Design an enzyme around this catalytic site. Structure first.
Site, PDB file in Angstrom:
ATOM      1  N   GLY A 159       0.810  -1.203   0.000  1.00 15.98           N
ATOM      2  CA  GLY A 159       0.000   0.000   0.000  1.00 15.98           C
ATOM      3  C   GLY A 159       0.844   1.254   0.000  1.00 15.98           C
ATOM      4  CD  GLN A 187       3.161   7.734   1.761  1.00  8.98           C
ATOM      5  OE1 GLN A 187       2.009   7.299   1.782  1.00  8.98           O
ATOM      6  NE2 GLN A 187       3.435   9.021   1.863  1.00  8.98           N
ATOM      7  N   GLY A 239      -7.099   0.771  -0.619  1.00  8.22           N
ATOM      8  CA  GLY A 239      -7.518  -0.340  -1.452  1.00  8.22           C
ATOM      9  C   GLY A 239      -6.456  -1.414  -1.560  1.00  8.22           C
ATOM     10  CB  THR A 240      -2.938  -1.270  -2.701  1.00  7.72           C
ATOM     11  OG1 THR A 240      -3.425  -0.381  -3.723  1.00  7.72           O
ATOM     12  CG2 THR A 240      -2.034  -2.320  -3.328  1.00  7.72           C
ATOM     13  CB  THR A 262      -7.042   9.552   4.576  1.00 12.87           C
ATOM     14  OG1 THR A 262      -6.954   8.190   5.019  1.00 12.87           O
ATOM     15  CG2 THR A 262      -6.062  10.401   5.370  1.00 12.87           C
ATOM     16  CG  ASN A 314      -2.227   8.810  10.528  1.00 18.33           C
ATOM     17  OD1 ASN A 314      -1.011   8.938  10.676  1.00 18.33           O
ATOM     18  ND2 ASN A 314      -2.908   9.512   9.637  1.00 18.33           N
ATOM     19  CG  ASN A 330       5.169   6.878   7.372  1.00 13.72           C
ATOM     20  OD1 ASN A 330       4.128   6.400   7.830  1.00 13.72           O
ATOM     21  ND2 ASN A 330       5.231   7.421   6.167  1.00 13.72           N
ATOM     22  CD  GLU A 360      11.083 -15.759  23.887  1.00 13.36           C
ATOM     23  OE1 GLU A 360      11.000 -15.152  24.977  1.00 13.36           O
ATOM     24  OE2 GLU A 360      12.170 -15.950  23.299  1.00 13.36           O
TER      25      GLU A 360
HETATM   26  N1  LIG Z   1       0.920   7.585   9.703  1.00 19.01           N
HETATM   27  C1  LIG Z   1       0.665   7.656   8.429  1.00 19.01           C
HETATM   28  N2  LIG Z   1      -0.581   7.511   7.978  1.00 19.01           N
HETATM   29  C2  LIG Z   1      -0.677   7.612   6.613  1.00 19.01           C
HETATM   30  C3  LIG Z   1       0.357   7.856   5.701  1.00 19.01           C
HETATM   31  N3  LIG Z   1      -0.120   7.898   4.413  1.00 19.01           N
HETATM   32  C4  LIG Z   1      -1.404   7.699   4.536  1.00 19.01           C
HETATM   33  N4  LIG Z   1      -1.808   7.512   5.834  1.00 19.01           N
HETATM   34  C5  LIG Z   1      -3.181   7.265   6.311  1.00 19.01           C
HETATM   35  O1  LIG Z   1      -3.644   6.043   5.714  1.00 19.01           O
HETATM   36  C6  LIG Z   1      -4.908   6.277   5.039  1.00 19.01           C
HETATM   37  C7  LIG Z   1      -4.687   6.516   3.579  1.00 19.01           C
HETATM   38  O2  LIG Z   1      -4.664   5.365   2.756  1.00 19.01           O
HETATM   39  P1  LIG Z   1      -4.424   5.720   1.167  1.00 19.01           P
HETATM   40  O3  LIG Z   1      -3.140   6.419   0.969  1.00 19.01           O
HETATM   41  O4  LIG Z   1      -5.641   6.451   0.709  1.00 19.01           O
HETATM   42  O5  LIG Z   1      -4.435   4.350   0.496  1.00 19.01           O
HETATM   43  P2  LIG Z   1      -3.510   3.132   0.478  1.00 19.01           P
HETATM   44  O6  LIG Z   1      -3.907   2.370   1.731  1.00 19.01           O
HETATM   45  O7  LIG Z   1      -2.108   3.482   0.293  1.00 19.01           O
HETATM   46  O8  LIG Z   1      -4.053   2.216  -0.780  1.00 19.01           O
HETATM   47  P3  LIG Z   1      -5.027   2.731  -2.020  1.00 19.01           P
HETATM   48  O9  LIG Z   1      -6.398   3.160  -1.509  1.00 19.01           O
HETATM   49  O10 LIG Z   1      -5.342   1.637  -3.048  1.00 19.01           O
HETATM   50  O11 LIG Z   1      -4.249   3.885  -2.620  1.00 19.01           O
HETATM   51  C8  LIG Z   1      -5.475   7.539   5.649  1.00 19.01           C
HETATM   52  O12 LIG Z   1      -6.218   7.221   6.804  1.00 19.01           O
HETATM   53  C9  LIG Z   1      -4.215   8.340   5.942  1.00 19.01           C
HETATM   54  O13 LIG Z   1      -4.466   9.245   7.020  1.00 19.01           O
HETATM   55  C10 LIG Z   1       1.652   8.013   6.191  1.00 19.01           C
HETATM   56  O14 LIG Z   1       2.664   8.219   5.527  1.00 19.01           O
HETATM   57  N5  LIG Z   1       1.736   7.893   7.596  1.00 19.01           N
HETATM   58 MG   LIG Z   2      -1.863   4.432  -2.718  1.00 25.78          MG
END
Ligand SMILES: Nc1nc2c(ncn2[C@@H]2O[C@H](COP(=O)(O)OP(=O)(O)OP(=O)(O)O)[C@@H](O)[C@H]2O)c(=O)[nH]1
Ligand SMILES: [Mg+2]
Ligand SMILES: CC(=O)O[C@H]1C(=O)[C@@]2(C)[C@H]([C@H](OC(=O)c3ccccc3)[C@]3(O)C[C@H](OC(=O)[C@H](O)[C@@H](NC(=O)c4ccccc4)c4ccccc4)C(C)=C1C3(C)C)[C@]1(OC(C)=O)CO[C@@H]1C[C@@H]2O
Ligand SMILES: Nc1nc2c(ncn2[C@@H]2O[C@H](COP(=O)(O)OP(=O)(O)O)[C@@H](O)[C@H]2O)c(=O)[nH]1
Lengths: 296, 412, 426
Positions: free
Chosen positions: B9, B14, B117-118, B152, B179, B201, B227
């Site tokens: 994802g 990230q 989604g992913t 998000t 988050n 992250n 464990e």
């Molecule tokens: N802590 C943290 N939360 C993140 C980060 N990027 C996204 N999020 C959170 O994760 C969710 C976003 O998911 P998306 O980026 O839309 O989607 P994805 O899970 O990567 O997969 P797709 O929907 O298919 O693109 C939201 O709730 C964001 O607040 C990040 O770098 N750090």
């Molecule tokens: Mg994505």
């Protein structure tokens, strides 16, 4: 009016079913109204208008609702029959029937001709593939559009018009149409009884059983049309439940729902027939089939 | 011993990028080093391309970086049935190939988010298959939990419910981090109003480094992945423990790194520092793992735990007499030079599972049911080949977990 | 993620001419030159709208379809008209009469054959085709008429792909064509049954925005189209670049339309200030949301204050923290909860990209689907019936080739759409 009446059909105990796996008492029969589910353990209660089988054959099933249905249609009423089932559910035996034991279709034809100056029988047969309909009234080789009348209901344009003088002619019609058929697709058979010194339409619907398995988005597309149809029934179910409701019907959603809109929006009784297997392994199949009809 | 990580994802990649950065950095390895024991999969080429052009570009291999140049979307159905089952074959092959190269791997380290989604669909079928082939392995996942309010995606809880319904039977332990809570810690403790995704992250990476990397290193009291689940999950269902840190002090404003063991540990028992929105409202502690890294005295730990045990404020489960897993390492918590962390000689990693998770689930489930009631974007799932049955079965399974957690504790 | 653009009608060609004049600056591509972009990030995403071939000559996939040769001729003789390949020039010297039936049943039908061939040629380029972009006006022969048949065959050919259409809504106060409502009713009919994404751009609203928020004395048509083009780029193009939260057409549509009834979106722009006195640099974060969710910032004539916000897609483009963005959006939903839909937890889908429109620090594009947009349809519906009952210029349609009932077909559908919206509004 009446509510969409759903009838559950249990395939007569076949050797292939019991040989496949332990059929046992997966589907239980506790009265004609309700059914007890003991799927090898999974507990569920299925409430329907009337359940038929596995003891009850096709003739007895037809004699109940369909026998009366034919008479109603001949009177000039609009009636739609819904037939659903997945793989090996025994849809062919229930709708078409066998050589010896005629199904709902052949038996209905017998009653149609039994009512037999202004008497014209128009039968049309078309199937839907990728949101596009194709007229099966004949052709092996190859746009169809729904236009809406001043009445409000839509009609299928560019459809073929064939007169059915004999029962065998109607039977032959379906045979040809079935040959040029696209587990894929929904075909509708419409028998119009036009009696004059009067419009009635009796339409049969062969619905594909849905799939979560692996042309673009074929399964997902047909799955959508299956859900939209269900939402339409649900909307009406709660509409008649309460004194009134907004009733936003998803007719516009799929092409099939618009054809169905003619009948569904108009005055007419609907018959929802879902045929499933009493087998335990087919629980996933039967479950999805039952979820189409819905719980009370 | 070895643990192959499966980051999936956008957020997964990230977070993995920041996690792996600290990993090699704390090992004194340059970007142009060793062979990374992890893989990255997503449905957006741009996400993977960022790593192929960013930091540690040549640290990873193209074989462990799958690029789905077709579609990504943000719906479970699409990233599972439609396009999800497209690259799954290749992905499974890649991880299996690496598993054959390793020398007695303990399991896989899943990294994803419950939303998206992913990160939802792919993970679900990935772990499903992994548990069928490598069932005799430890399944540790770091599922990023969606914020309670700060969502998000509109269909955020619409995907999470499905993810936690199927993978729940094909997982051992799911470390959940909120988050929104990351922002809280960054605002309350770090006192920063500019928390970029990378910062969020990096905080989690700091945790992961103390959960896998350092823990896999030789210490005073070693703790294997076996464990972990043996004490963290007292039931067959994949429980979701919380990841809490101790040294969350800033490296500029506040300057009191000289905190005793009794202080750092006590800091992992407060809602202000839990890294999750599961406030201690009625969460009875059933299992709590305390991983100490750096200068840690055995007796100090024993005394610290005893001090909390007789505190009475922190209620534990009735059938849980001593649900505290002790872990003592030697290497201190390594921190990035250009960061916001003060960098202490000792750190505490609090991993506890309580009944507080019920509140989180109750909110997420409610948000989902409310949308499902009006159907919502369900049509965007149906067209992908997903039926209503799947959603309903997920709702029912989630409800079971809601009752399950309240049946674990609460009642004596 | 490749996308193909198609311009239908005189207005569509004019708007497209501006779009491909702004997006070219976004990617840094010279009219008949190559990549002259400042940075290099723009080059890593040129395949989205441009197609590789000669190497130096990056051609934009934009098919021009219009029955008026003069329109396409003026564009091909402009500062950016030489970048279009002769292949994309699908002209038809026929009856360019402003009539839906003319550009759909008669003259349009015959020209569609060639269009279908060109669209197929462009769709089979490389990578993966995402969807199609169409620009047209709801009051023209090739615009509303041909635009209809165009999208009809497109969706029929590739139903797996999305359709991003930009519908030019006729000005309510003073329309342009007298048969505008008639054409609009017919276009919206197929629109709701073909395209999946459609933005509403009003002609009068465009004037208002450039008159009140901007310091433009005479908002010329080119200036008007400029604003729209500079807005659409922040939707498609902007969602193809790396950022904090990368989105896309699918990520947007699948998070904007709660129901398969098309659902029209209303665009807007936060950093809408003048170059002179309004250069206050007031773009920290709250100012963006303040102007984005402004009744006088809507690119449509209808205001969302009179309706309910069904779903909002906020696409930010610039360096900013997730905390300042998401937290501010929450405040908006909580403060304006009265019309933000209570049957949905979060109606605002956030998206933050890390790339501003060149000469800008912070920027945010507004895309909101609100039930208040029903007032727009209600207006067209009222205009239609008003002249439909009297059959004003009905003969113009029957003369070419149109059904008397066809008129009602579109009317009943448009009216039914308004109903669906209102039901969910209350
Ligand atoms: N802590 C943290 N939360 C993140 C980060 N990027 C996204 N999020 C959170 O994760 C969710 C976003 O998911 P998306 O980026 O839309 O989607 P994805 O899970 O990567 O997969 P797709 O929907 O298919 O693109 C939201 O709730 C964001 O607040 C990040 O770098 N750090
Ligand atoms: Mg994505
Ligand atoms: C010295 C300086 O900073 O000048 C600014 C400027 O003064 C202002 C007023 C610009 C200016 O825009 C307008 O005056 C305008 C004219 C017609 C229609 C609409 C707008 C500007 O012309 C527009 C220009 O925009 C861009 O460069 C973006 O990349 C933008 N580009 C175009 O629209 C474009 C224009 C001509 C040719 C090719 C592209 C963009 C926006 C979104 C998506 C893609 C591109 C900018 C910042 C400015 C000037 C130059 C004065 C503003 O507009 C935009 C879209 O940024 C108007 O309010 C904003 C605030 C800006 O500060
Ligand atoms: N924004 C905008 N609207 C335009 C432009 N040209 C025509 N229009 C609008 O389009 C409508 C007229 O349709 P037109 O484009 O002439 O139709 P066609 O050329 O026959 O397809 C009127 O409402 C105009 O305001 C333009 O360049 N920009």
């Amino acid at each position: 009016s009446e509510k969409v009446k759903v009838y559950l059909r249990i395939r007569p105990f076949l050797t292939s079913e019991l040989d496949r796996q332990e059929d046992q008492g997966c589907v239980c029969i506790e009265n004609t109204e309700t059914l007890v589910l003991q799927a090898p353990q999974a507990t569920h209660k299925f409430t329907f208008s009337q359940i038929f089988g596995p003891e009850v054959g096709q003739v007895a099933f037809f004699n109940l609702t369909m026998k009366e249905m034919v008479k109603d249609v001949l009177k000039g009423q609009n009636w739609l029959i819904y037939t659903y089932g997945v793989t090996n559910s025994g849809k062919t035996y229930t709708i078409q029937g066998t050589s010896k034991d005629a199904g709902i279709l052949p038996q209905s034809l017998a009653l149609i001709f039994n009512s037999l100056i202004r008497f014209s029988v128009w039968i049309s047969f078309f199937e839907i593939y990728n949101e596009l309909l194709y007229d099966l009234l004949e052709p092996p080789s190859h746009t169809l559009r729904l236009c809406e009348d001043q009445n409000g209901n839509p009609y299928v344009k560019d459809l073929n018009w064939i007169h059915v003088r004999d029962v065998e002619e109607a039977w032959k019609l379906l045979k040809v149409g079935r040959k040029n058929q696209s587990s894929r697709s929904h075909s509708i058979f419409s028998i119009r009884i036009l009696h004059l010194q009067k419009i009635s339409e009796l339409s049969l619907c062969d619905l594909a059983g849905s799939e979560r398995c692996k042309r673009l988005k074929e399964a997902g597309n047909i799955n959508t049309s299956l859900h939209t149809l269900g939402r339409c029934i649900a909307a009406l179910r709660q509409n008649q439940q309460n004194r009134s409701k907004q009733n936003l019907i998803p007719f516009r959603d799929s092409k099939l729902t618009r054809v169905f809109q003619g009948f569904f929006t108009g005055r007419g009784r609907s018959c929802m027939i879902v045929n499933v297997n009493p087998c335990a392994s087919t629980y996933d199949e039967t479950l999805h089939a039952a979820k189409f009809s819905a719980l009370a | 011993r070895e643990c192959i990580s499966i980051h999936v994802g956008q957020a997964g990649v990230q977070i993995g990028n920041a996690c792996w950065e600290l990993y090699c950095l704390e090992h004194g390895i340059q970007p142009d080093g060793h062979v990374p024991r992890a893989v990255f999969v997503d449905l957006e080429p741009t996400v993977i391309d960022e790593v192929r052009t960013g930091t540690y570009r040549q640290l990873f291999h193209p074989e462990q970086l799958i690029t789905g140049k077709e579609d990504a979307a943000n719906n479970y159905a699409r990233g599972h049935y439609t396009i999800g089952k497209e690259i799954i074959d290749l992905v499974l092959d890649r991880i299996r190939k690496l598993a054959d190269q390793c020398t007695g791997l303990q399991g896989f380290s899943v990294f994803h988010s419950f939303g998206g989604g992913t990160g939802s669909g792919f993970t679900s079928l990935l772990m499903e298959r992994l548990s069928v082939d490598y069932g005799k392995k430890s399944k540790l996942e770091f599922s990023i939990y969606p914020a309670p309010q700060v969502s998000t995606a509109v269909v955020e809880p619409y995907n999470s419910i499905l993810t936690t319904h199927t993978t729940l039977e094909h997982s051992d332990c799911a470390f959940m981090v909120d988050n929104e809570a990351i922002y809280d810690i960054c605002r309350r403790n770090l006192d920063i109003e500019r928390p970029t995704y990378t910062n969020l992250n990096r905080l989690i990476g700091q945790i992961v480094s103390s959960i896998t990397a350092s823990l896999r290193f030789d210490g005073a009291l070693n703790v294997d992945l076996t464990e972990f689940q043996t004490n963290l999950v007292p039931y067959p269902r994949g429980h979701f423990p919380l990841a809490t840190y101790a040294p969350v002090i800033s490296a500029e404003k506040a300057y009191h790194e000289q905190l005793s063991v009794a202080e750092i540990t006590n800091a992992c028992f407060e809602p202000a520092n839990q890294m999750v929105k599961c406030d201690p409202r009625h969460g009875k502690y059933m299992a709590c793992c305390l991983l100490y890294r750096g200068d840690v005295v055995p007796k100090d730990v024993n005394a610290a735990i005893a001090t909390i045990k007789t505190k009475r404020t922190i209620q534990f489960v009735d059938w849980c007499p001593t649900g505290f897993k002790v872990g003592i390492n030697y290497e201190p918590p390594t921190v990035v030079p250009g960061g916001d962390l003060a960098k202490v000689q000792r750190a505490v990693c609090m991993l506890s599972n309580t009944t507080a998770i019920a509140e989180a689930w109750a909110r997420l489930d409610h948000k989902f049911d409310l949308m499902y009631a009006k159907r919502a974007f369900v049509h965007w799932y149906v067209g992908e080949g997903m039926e209503e049955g799947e959603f309903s079965e997920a709702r029912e399974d989630m409800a079971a977990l809601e009752k399950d957690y309240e049946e674990v504790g609460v009642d004596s | 993620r490749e996308i193909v653009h198609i311009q239908a009608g005189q207005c569509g060609n004019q708007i497209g001419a501006k779009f491909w004049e702004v997006i070219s600056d976004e990617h840094g591509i010279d009219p008949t030159g190559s990549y002259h972009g400042d940075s290099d990030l723009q080059l890593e995403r040129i395949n989205v709208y441009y197609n590789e071939a000669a190497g130096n000559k990056y051609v934009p996939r934009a098919i021009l379809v219009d029955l008026e040769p003069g329109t396409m001729d003026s564009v091909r003789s402009g500062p950016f008209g030489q970048i279009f390949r002769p292949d994309n020039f699908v002209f038809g010297q026929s009856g360019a009469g402003n009539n839906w039936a003319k550009g759909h049943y008669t003259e349009g039908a015959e020209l569609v054959d060639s269009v279908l061939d060109v669209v197929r040629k462009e769709s089979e380029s490389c990578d993966c085709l995402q969807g199609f972009q169409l620009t047209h006006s709801l009051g023209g022969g090739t615009g509303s008429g041909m635009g209809t048949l165009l999208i009809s065959k497109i969706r029929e050919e590739y139903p797996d792909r999305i359709m991003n259409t930009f519908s030019v809504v006729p000005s309510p106060k003073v329309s342009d064509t007298v048969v505008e409502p008639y054409n609009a009713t017919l276009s919206v009919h197929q629109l709701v049954e073909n395209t999946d994404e459609t933005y509403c751009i009003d002609n009068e609203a465009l004037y208002d925005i450039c008159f009140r928020t901007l310091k433009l004395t005479t908002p010329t048509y080119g200036d008007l189209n400029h604003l729209v083009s500079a807005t659409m780029s922040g939707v498609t193009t902007c969602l193809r670049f790396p950022g904090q939260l990368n989105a896309d057409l699918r990520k947007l549509a699948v998070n904007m339309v709660p129901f398969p009834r098309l659902h029209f979106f209303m665009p807007g722009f936060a950093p809408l200030t003048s170059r002179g006195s309004q250069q206050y640099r007031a773009l920290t974060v709250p100012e963006l949301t303040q102007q984005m969710f402004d009744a006088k910032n809507m690119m449509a004539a209808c205001d969302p204050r009179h309706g309910r916000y069904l779903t909002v897609a906020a696409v930010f483009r610039g360096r900013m923290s997730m905390k300042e963005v998401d937290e501010q959006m929450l405040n908006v939903q909580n403060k304006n909860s009265s019309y933000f839909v209570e049957w949905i937890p979060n109606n605002v889908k956030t998206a933050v990209c890390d790339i501003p429109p060149r000469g800008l620090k912070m920027s945010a594009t507004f895309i909101g689907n609100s039930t208040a947009i029903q007032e727009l349809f209600k207006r067209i519906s009222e205009q239609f019936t008003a002249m439909f009952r009297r059959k004003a210029f009905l003969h113009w349609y029957t003369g070419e080739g149109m059904d008397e009932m066809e008129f009602t077909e579109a009317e009943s559908n448009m009216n039914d759409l308004v109903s669906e919206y209102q039901q969910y509004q209350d």
